Amino acid sequence: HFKTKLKNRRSEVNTCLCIGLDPDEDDIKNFMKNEEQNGYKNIKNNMNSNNNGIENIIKIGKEILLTDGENIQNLSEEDKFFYFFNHFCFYIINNTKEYALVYKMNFAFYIPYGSVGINALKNVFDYLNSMNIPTMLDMKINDIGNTVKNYRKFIFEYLKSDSCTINVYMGTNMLKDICFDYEKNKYYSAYVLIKTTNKDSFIFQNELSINDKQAYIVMADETQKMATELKIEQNNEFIGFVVGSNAFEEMKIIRNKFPDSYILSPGIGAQNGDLYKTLKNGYNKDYEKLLINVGRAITKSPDPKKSSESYYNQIIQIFKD
Which residues form the Orotidine 5'-phosphate decarboxylase domain (predicted)? Predict the structure, then answer.
């Protein structure tokens, strides 16, 4: 159960830090060069980490991943990309987990290579689940009820994520078919898009209204009315909100209207979100109820452990103000 898994983890790490794991083509180039230069220092650590996690947990491409850094030339172009891509992923998690409440994997970064990156994504979730670390797939899913049950299967049964992001512009009925499996009486947690970090986000979320009540608040209301119709919390799960760290005014409106709501706040670091106005406006005594996502400021750092420690420390301090 996600509510209790977040509450627990947080007593393990005492933080808000949600780490975004969005690897791109320059990450893998950089990581490859870094490993060439350092004698495969990080990949060597990956061979040993999470109590021998590759050997004992990875089920797709294990033999490739166990290749000695100094036998890479023996692999295909494709197997070579799979190798570094997966290794880059394991390196980030191995180095940043002691500061992470949750990892959020944005699907967009895994699908452009077809089956290569989907295989890696499965490896990633399996690896994280092996350590009971809270997980999220950021995929901003939407479709009709019958069609979305497919995304429920992929996210919640095959990857076995704890949560995902959903766009409910089509409607809230879809939540019934993503966050609830009737046959299994199983509930799955998610976060619904309310205020997004893109610069033109005002265009529909703000300009649209019902009687000067702005779209993003309507959607928040409808989302929770659906979550209560579903009795999702009876099962210690929830449907929460995405409100970007650049939208601190909206953040204040949402936390005040919905004080016990689980919120995810992206856009810190690379997207130039405001950390203090975010945490002040979105504060909750239960820290898991406000996830602060940091992606590229950590994954693109020369030292992701240290970068993650930075944000962790940053947070510990704002709280003490």
Answer: 16-311
Resolution value in angstroms: 2.0
Residues catalogued as catalytic? 140
Written as one string, the DSSP assignment of 40-62 is: SHHHHHHTTHHHHHHHHH--SSH
Q: Counting every residue, how long is the chain?
A: 321
On the 0-12 / 13-18 / 19+ scale of CB atoms within 10 A, 113 is middle
In this structure, the number of other CB atoms found within 10 A of the CB of residue 83 comes to 23
Name the residue among 316, 196, 172 with its Cα closest to residue 247.
Answer: 196
Q: How much helix, strand and coil, in percent to the nearest 5, is found in the chain? A: 55, 15, 30
Rounded distance between C-alpha atoms, residue 110 and residue 257, angstroms: 36
Rounded alpha-carbon distances, angstroms, from residue 316 to 13, 103, 267, 304:
11, 19, 19, 18
Distance CA 84, CA 69 (A): 10
Residue 254: domain span: 1-321
Q: Are 135 and 161 within 8 A, CB to CB?
A: yes
**Cβ atoms of 262 and 5 closer than 8 Å:** no
Three-state SS annotation for 99-148: HCCEEEEEHHHCCCCCHHHHHHHHHHHHHHHHCCCCEEEEEEECCCHHHH
Max CA pair span of the chain = 66
- Report the amino acid identity of residue 114: G
Q: Which two tokens stand for residue 179?
A: 């966050």
Chain position carrying tokens 């100094």? 70
Q: What is the DSSP code (8-state) at residue 195?
A: E
Residue 164 tokens, joined: 């995902």
Domain count for the chain, please give it: 1
Q: What is the CATH number of the domain that holds 192?
A: 3.20.20.70
Which residue's structure tokens are 């990450």? 27
Name the experimental technique. Answer: X-ray
